[PDB]
Amino acid sequence: SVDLIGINVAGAEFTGGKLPGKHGTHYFFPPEGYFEYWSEQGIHTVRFPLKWERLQPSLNAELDDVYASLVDDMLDQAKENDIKVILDVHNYARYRKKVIGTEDVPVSAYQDLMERIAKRWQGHDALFAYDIMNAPYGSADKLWPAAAQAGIDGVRKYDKKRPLLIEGASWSSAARWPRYADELLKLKDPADNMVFSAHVYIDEDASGSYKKGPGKDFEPMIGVKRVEPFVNWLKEHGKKGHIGEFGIPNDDERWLDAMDKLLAYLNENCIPINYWAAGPSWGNYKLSIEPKDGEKRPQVALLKKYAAKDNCSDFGPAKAE
Ligand SMILES: OC[C@H]1O[C@@H](O[C@H]2[C@H](O)[C@@H](O)[C@H](O[C@H]3[C@H](O)[C@@H](O)[C@H](O)O[C@@H]3CO)O[C@@H]2CO)[C@H](O)[C@@H](O)[C@@H]1O
């Protein structure tokens, strides 16, 4: 089933310059007991970033045994705790810093990754969906629609059922979505089960850096205003949508006000959200909602408030009848 309220659980993609890196030093999967907390809080959908270069250290080669087995174990813990998991290839449409579709990283190698991901995990009950690439940007933008088709073809070799979450150019900006997304209308899914997934941060430059506070002329509808181009594009083209990332600092009511207005608009349109982010090794990261001694997490109350208002049976927005 489709939960409107979900969270990112980040950590497996950390310290991306250390490849392969060492689990528990450079990157972090959920420990035992991790999902039990969020399950108890009423959050039952998790988006889970993975680093492509760790899953597949050589293009077209078998998946890495150590890192892929950590994914196996996370999915097991998810299933044990009634957690639905969106696997996220958290790679900005690049492999070892080279754009998918260049000579260095042919689209067939990206198709290969997605085939092996689907082949390994389509049988797993905790797997909910594939977010096939996180936040394409920059020099990857123009090649990304062709890359996405290869990723879709890859998953569909082995998983004919589950939703594919398709992000957009420009860090999958919700605010700029229709500037680029017409290129995604060419994508073909044989299973006809794609969901487009945009991201939204509400600091001025939408980077999620939150270097400054809200500012005196802060607009509390800024979150709604920044997802409206995305949701309206979905309505215009009869598509289904999703917000894969949104996060705010914990230290100004204006941020929380904008978050509440955002969740209201997403609820009205049956658009799920994955809050960015929870995770086992965030420290004092300003957007973290992971419990931390002495750190307040007002955002989690808003998530629970809207988890209880979730009356949707499928990804929105609704089509006209
Ligand atoms: O850094 C790790 C996280 O990055 C998130 O992406 C952000 C990029 O890091 C940031 O460079 C980019 O900033 C853009 C901004 O989006 C755009 O509006 C402005 O015009 O230009 C900026 C670059 O100068 O923002 C994105 C967020 O929108 C990933 O989303 C996250 O997955 C990853 O963990």
- The values of phi and psi at residue 188, to 5°, are -120, 125
Whether ligand 1 lies within 6 angstroms of the CB of 208 is answered as yes
How much distance in Å is there from the Cα of 234 to the middle of ligand 1?
22
Q: Residue 23 to residues 27, 54, 63, 68, 71: CA-CA distances in angstroms?
A: 5, 11, 16, 12, 12
CA dihedral for 234, 237, 238, 240, sign (positive or negative): negative
Strands (E), the chain: 5-9, 45-50, 84-89, 94-95, 98-99, 127-131, 164-166, 194-199, 241-246, 273-278
Single-letter residue type at 273: I
Alpha carbon dihedral 62, 65, 70, 74, in 10-degree steps, equals 50
Whether ligand 1 lies within 6 angstroms of the CB of 198 is answered as no
Atom of ligand 1 lying closest to residue 245 CA: 30
DSSP label at residue 184: G
Mode of pairing for the β-strands spanning 84-89 and 94-95: unpaired
Residue with CA nearest ligand 1 atom 14: 207
Whether ligand 1 lies within 6 angstroms of the CB of 203 is answered as no
How much distance in Å is there from the Cα of 206 to the middle of ligand 1?
7
* Nearest Cα residue to 143 out of 180, 198, 188: 180
Pair 193, 162: CB distance under 8 Å: yes
CA dihedral for 190, 315, 237, 94, sign (positive or negative): negative
Whether ligand 1 lies within 6 angstroms of the CB of 199 is answered as yes
* Nearest Cα residue to 166 out of 140, 189, 143, 200: 189
* Nearest Cα residue to 56 out of 102, 95, 22: 95
Whether ligand 1 lies within 6 angstroms of the CB of 171 is answered as yes
* Cα separation, 238 vs 184, whole angstroms: 13
Q: Residue 277 to residues 246, 247, 290: CA-CA distances in angstroms?
A: 8, 7, 8
- Structure solved using which method? X-ray
Helix (H/G/I), strand (E/B), else coil: 89 = strand
How much distance in Å is there from the Cα of 191 to the middle of ligand 1?
31
Looking up tokens 């995604």 gives 184
Q: Residue 124 to residues 10, 38, 52, 84, 214: CA-CA distances in angstroms?
A: 20, 20, 20, 10, 43
Mode of pairing for the β-strands spanning 127-131 and 164-166: parallel
* Nearest Cα residue to 155 out of 203, 123, 119, 126: 119
* Nearest Cα residue to 89 out of 61, 128, 52, 36: 52
* Cα separation, 243 vs 5, whole angstroms: 10
* Cα separation, 114 vs 306, whole angstroms: 33
Helix (H/G/I), strand (E/B), else coil: 274 = strand
Give the bridge partners for 94, in sequence order.
99
For 179-184, the CB contacts below 8 A with 24+ separation are 180/141, 181/233, 183/145, 184/145, 184/148
Reported resolution, Å: 1.7
Pair 158, 190: CB distance under 8 Å: no
Best substitution site from 167, 171, 225 to test ligand 1's pocket, by max atoms within 8 Å of Cβ?
171
Which domains are assigned to the chain?
Answer: 1-321 (3.20.20.80)
Atom of ligand 1 lying closest to residue 208 CA: 27
Tokens of 120: 């390994």
